[PDB]
Amino acid sequence: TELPSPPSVWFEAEFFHHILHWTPIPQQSESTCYEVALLRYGIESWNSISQCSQTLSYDLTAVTLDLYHSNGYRARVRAVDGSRHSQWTVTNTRFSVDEVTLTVGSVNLEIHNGFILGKIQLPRPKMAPAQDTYESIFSHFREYEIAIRKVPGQFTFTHKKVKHEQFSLLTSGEVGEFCVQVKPSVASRSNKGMWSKEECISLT
Amino acid sequence: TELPSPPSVWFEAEFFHHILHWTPIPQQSESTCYEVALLRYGIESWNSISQCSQTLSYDLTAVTLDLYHSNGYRARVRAVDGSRHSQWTVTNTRFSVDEVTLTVGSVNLEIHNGFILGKIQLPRPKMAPAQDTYESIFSHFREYEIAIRKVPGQFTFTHKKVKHEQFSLLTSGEVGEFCVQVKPSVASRSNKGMWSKEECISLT
Amino acid sequence: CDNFPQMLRDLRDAFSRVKTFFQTKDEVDNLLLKESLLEDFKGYLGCQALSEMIQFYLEEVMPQAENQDPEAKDHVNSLGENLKTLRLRLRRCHRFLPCENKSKAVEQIKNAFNKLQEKGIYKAMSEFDIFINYIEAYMTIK
Amino acid sequence: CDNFPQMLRDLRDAFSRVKTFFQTKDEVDNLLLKESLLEDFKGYLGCQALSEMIQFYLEEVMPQAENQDPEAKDHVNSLGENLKTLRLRLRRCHRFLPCENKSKAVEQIKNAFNKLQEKGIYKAMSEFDIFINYIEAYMTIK
């Protein structure tokens, strides 16, 4: 008779995109919604961001801008229907820079000499202070994994690794097209990354 | 029947003036002289400066110039007459900067306003390298004790203390002459000093 | 110097495998490691602070834990080795953990003295005047 | 800072009253305190060297001496107090003997932790991620 708490709450961050996520209480009625609440680690003060959300994800980037200067956060979600509510279900872990998934803005390819130059525009998110560029926060140890595919070819790849947003790739001449993807990281940290959207370049 | 060693050997140093001194063996015959030998602490190598000296003091400044850059010396004297000699009598302690008696070149007095200015020319010994000025060796902590006497007056003094080679003395006007002496030292060290030669100044 | 970046990571990794088991429990939410420690770190006691902290985490913290929550034993220990291992690679590149290293000169000498029996005492006391000339030399380095 | 010049002197003075009794005996004339020590002093182990030396002179050297030549007992002890006394006035003006001081932040914290029983273990392990963010902060200070 007393509403069920949401099974689990968790973050799905990316450089300024700290969306919260949760799973629905079983038998969720068409009138039930959820309440999203935050907490700046260091102050026993929970702040209610949302009173009602008929979604299973809320974007908390804006109230978590200090993420990369703070010591994490704690979110928690609650189910609401009529006068009753479900116990709060807090995030299992603290939300810091640790859990942010490293992605990359894009990659442009230029076919030169007989080699290919490529610069990696890091991500530039709208809701991101000027004082906080991907380079500021992550000043040193930016490495990338590069996967190059050939076409016409088979769905196979060559793997390389660099330490700057501008790399090159020793070309042998004989191909009709190359495609590349990147995956960033910071050696000092264990943050997982995400392979960029494929960016092909015709050699012909 | 075997010549007696000199009772004791000792230094009487002053900024570059490292004279050695010793007492005569008893019943010193008119034909006995002494042998002066040095030793740079750090090398078991005694070097004979003098073969014969019918004195009781030898000036070793020249072979001890490194005194203020070295870790001391050890002198020793021996009695010689005919084919026999006396056991060596080494200095009881190592000769370093410690045992150098701090003196001062001089002091010039100028009678101004109604006060007296005085600058203390530190000692400038001939056999002293340019690289070694009293200020170089003794870079910081130069203090002086000042004794001022009044004349006409009684053989009494006023005592003061400064920290620079140029000091002044609050004058009350009513005297006919003042005389001063100084005594240097270095607070970091326990070196004894020597009161300068009196340097009077007529107020009239 | 040695392996700066990497060794840091090897460390956080040992933690990612435990972050949970422990963050689950943590209920009160006030910062223990107050930024004041980051101040002792940005200070001259910095080497002491860091050494005192590692000393803290491998003797008090983890120990009382590995046992406390047995199921955690195996992994707390793992982290607590990447720590032991960081300490070393650290107090090697002297530039970082000097307060945990020890002078060879002081040993060579401490050696000579031991191999000079009853006489060692005399020469030691006779050069103390130089010892003082050294100590002062050390103070002008400020 | 505290009493730089003077305390040095107060020390050599305690020695002038003994310089003899000991320099008399010293027969072999090779430098024990090799200038290499002055090198560890002009180095990062400098604090260690000096602390190791004082540790040397008050535990090995003097001790074995004060007793060795009883007649020297009273005065070696005197010097060995101007030493004890220099140590303090020194590991106070932190700028000089940091390797002998201990962080308050590490205590305050080490305090909090002790006054949190079974729970202290959890929060300690939960913030270790921050500890690592500090340690790295300390390394960028080089």
Curated annotation (Swiss-Prot), chains A, B:
The residues that carry sugar chains are Q27, Q51, Q87, Q131, Q154, Q166
Compartment list: Cell membrane; Cytoplasm
Extracellular topological domain ranges are 1-204
Recorded disease: Inflammatory bowel disease 28, autosomal recessive: A chronic, relapsing inflammation of the gastrointestinal tract with a complex etiology. It is subdivided into Crohn disease and ulcerative colitis phenotypes. Crohn disease may affect any part of the gastrointestinal tract from the mouth to the anus, but most frequently it involves the terminal ileum and colon. Bowel inflammation is transmural and discontinuous; it may contain granulomas or be associated with intestinal or perianal fistulas.
Maturation and modification: Phosphorylated. Phosphorylation of the cytoplasmic tail induced STAT3 activation. Ubiquitinated by BTRC; ubiquitination leads to endocytosis and subsequent degradation of IL10RA.
Q: Which domain of life is it from?
A: Eukaryota
Disulfides per UniProt: C33-C52, C179-C200
The gene from which this protein is expressed is: IL10RA
Quaternary structure and interacting proteins, as annotated: Interacts with IL10. Interacts with IL10RB. Interacts (via its cytoplasmic domain) with JAK1 (via N-terminus). Interacts with BTRC; this interaction leads to IL10RA ubiquitination and subsequent degradation. Interacts with STAT3.
User: Could you identify this protein by its name?
Assistant: Interleukin-10 receptor subunit alpha
Q: Which organism is it from?
A: Homo sapiens (Human)
Q: What does this protein do?
A: Cell surface receptor for the cytokine IL10 that participates in IL10-mediated anti-inflammatory functions, limiting excessive tissue disruption caused by inflammation. Upon binding to IL10, induces a conformational change in IL10RB, allowing IL10RB to bind IL10 as well. In turn, the heterotetrameric assembly complex, composed of two subunits of IL10RA and IL10RB, activates the kinases JAK1 and TYK2 that are constitutively associated with IL10RA and IL10RB respectively.
Curated annotation (Swiss-Prot), chains C, D:
Q: Cellular component per GO?
A: extracellular space
On subunit structure and binding partners, the annotation says: Homodimer.
Please provide, alphabetically and separated by semicolons, the GO molecular function terms listed in this UniProt record: cytokine activity
- Please give the organism: Epstein-Barr virus (strain B95-8)
Q: Name one GO biological process term.
A: symbiont-mediated suppression of host pro-inflammatory cytokine signaling
Per its record, how is this protein called by name?
Answer: Viral interleukin-10 homolog
Record key words, sorted = Coiled coil, Cytokine, Disulfide bond, Evasion of host immunity by viral interleukin-like protein, Glycoprotein, Host-virus interaction, Secreted, Signal, Viral immunoevasion
Superkingdom to which the source organism belongs: Viruses
